[PDB]
Ligand binder design. Structure first.
Ligand SMILES: *[C@@H]1O[C@H](CO)[C@@H](O[C@@H]2O[C@H](CO)[C@@H](O)[C@H](O)[C@H]2NC(C)=O)[C@H](O)[C@H]1NC(C)=O
Ligand SMILES: *[C@@H]1O[C@H](CO)[C@@H](O[C@@H]2O[C@H](CO)[C@@H](O)[C@H](O)[C@H]2NC(C)=O)[C@H](O)[C@H]1NC(C)=O
Lengths: 209, 209
């Protein structure tokens, strides 16, 4: 017994590209049956708005319900620091629950992007690691991708952002390719999207030296 | 109203060095005042043991209490996969809460450790990044450190372990030094501790080529 509220920011890639649709998501869990109806009020910088959409009710595994409201946001509103408030009114609540999110505050800093070839030690293995170091960025909302000849690469993993000692963030992205592709002289690229880059996008290349 | 239980494994460095003292920690939060007393029963592979120690009661910020029991463990017991069960008996509980932890199961895999010098692009900055790539290890319990001339370095950060595509883990550790120290020819070392290394320890060096 007891309903709670979680509020999620848009996905980094979505806020950075005008072609994409950034959304903020209000998730209500433990919806007491005795009180199913949930009213959502949305506010952007205090001003109530209405372009939200409540997706189908989902059935939890505890005799309770999950109701999700999704609010489409303007890229520029999000990047400019506007606050999004989701107001959840229920009967099983002493008062409406109000949650709030916004972009992290603080001076945006531009990611420095560095590509690092495999250690000579790794050339004895069947596959090698190509490393993309992304550092010095703020806020931590970022997306990183790898590609070669214009097509996405499958076998890569990216660390979460890590808080660095100067208050900015860094991460690494590791791409794994067969040693044969590397040694031939194939060219690989690390793409980085972040608000503090020109056109929200930079890429750095890496191939055999 | 309602008491819960969290169970924490020992610290990686502690299980790997015989000189250190690995402990498992049973944390009880929301200790209903009406029922303060908490009895701890500890079990190692089902066998009850008694070398635990209950640290001073702490006062939460919700009219409830926090009681912590700490169990000293044998390095080899932990690394061999023995299960640690913490049994919390309280009056405000329908039944004693039993929680359980053990080392992650699965074939231990040896970390491959690779040191990577700064990208040539970074030599235009006042400080440079020295990168230690640690990959292919299992389980994810690991510790990484940096040093030069036998002394620990201050300015480094290590990513959490990341699940790689073959089911093993990797991480990176980034050491930041003034460009001047790098270019002079100072030698830096990345130390790695993990159960699947000989003597639970390896290190790799990195200096100007
Ligand atoms: C699922 O939750 C509902 C409440 O949301 C439980 O229902 C109530 O059951 C009590 C009997 O103990 C009745 O007095 C209430 O009037 C019921 N309320 C409603 C809205 O039906 C129900 O018992 C729960 N299901 C299970 C299997 O435990
Ligand atoms: C802190 O928690 C205690 C219970 O752990 C609360 O105490 C009880 O208060 C009710 C009155 O509403 C009494 O009928 C009970 O007998 C009390 N129990 C005990 C063990 O004292 C107490 O009210 C809480 N403190 C605050 C400030 O809310």
């Amino acid at each position: 017994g007891g309903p709670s509220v979680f509020l999620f920011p848009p996905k980094p890639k979505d806020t950075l590209m005008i072609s994409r649709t950034p959304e903020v998501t209000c998730v209500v869990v433990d919806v007491s049956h005795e009180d199913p109806e949930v009213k959502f009020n949305w506010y952007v910088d205090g001003v109530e708005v209405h372009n939200a959409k409540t997706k189908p009710r989902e059935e939890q595994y505890n005799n309770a319900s999950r109701v999700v409201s999704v609010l489409t946001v303007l890229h520029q509103d999000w990047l400019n620091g506007k606050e999004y408030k989701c107001k959840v009114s229920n009967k099983a609540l002493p008062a409406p629950i109000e949650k709030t999110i916004s972009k992290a505050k603080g001076q945006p800093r531009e990611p420095q992007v560095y590509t690092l070839p495999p250690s000579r030690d790794e050339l004895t293995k069947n596959q090698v690691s190509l490393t993309c170091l992304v550092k010095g960025f703020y806020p931590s909302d970022i997306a990183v991708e790898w590609e070669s000849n214009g097509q996405p690469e499958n076998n890569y993993k990216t660390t979460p952002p890590v808080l660095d000692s100067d208050g900015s963030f860094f991460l690494y992205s590791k791409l794994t390719v067969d040693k044969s592709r590397w040694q031939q002289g194939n060219v690989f690229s690390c793409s980085v999207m972040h608000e503090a880059l020109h056109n929200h996008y930079t890429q750095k290349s890496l191939s055999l030296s």
